[PDB]
């Protein structure tokens, strides 16, 4: 018969494990680089006992 147009078999739709297992509301990391504004040094504590 007449020519039929090709039907592109595009599927993709692999989705993504976007939903965490339960909620996986846990990505724990700690401050490491001694914060910023590293502040002063020993600030001469010394002792005050009356020698």
């Amino acid at each position: 018969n007449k020519t039929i147009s090709v039907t592109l078999g595009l599927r993709h739709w692999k989705t993504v494990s976007a939903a965490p297992p339960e909620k996986m509301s846990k990505s724990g990391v700690c401050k490491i680089a001694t914060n910023v504004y590293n502040r002063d040094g020993g600030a001469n504590p010394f002792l005050v006992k009356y020698e």
Binding site: S27, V29, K31, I32, A33, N35, V36
Partner: protein, 51 residues
Amino acid sequence: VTMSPESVVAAAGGGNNNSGYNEPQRFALVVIAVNHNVIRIMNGSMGFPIL
């Protein structure tokens, strides 16, 4: 910062009609700074390694 005679004379009122400084004027100072930072992406999470 050292201000200007125009500012110090416009702070007080006494300006005539449609002079803008008819009422006493008040001023404020604002400072903005632009800084760099580093962001780390790993294990499906983000954070600042430097804080």
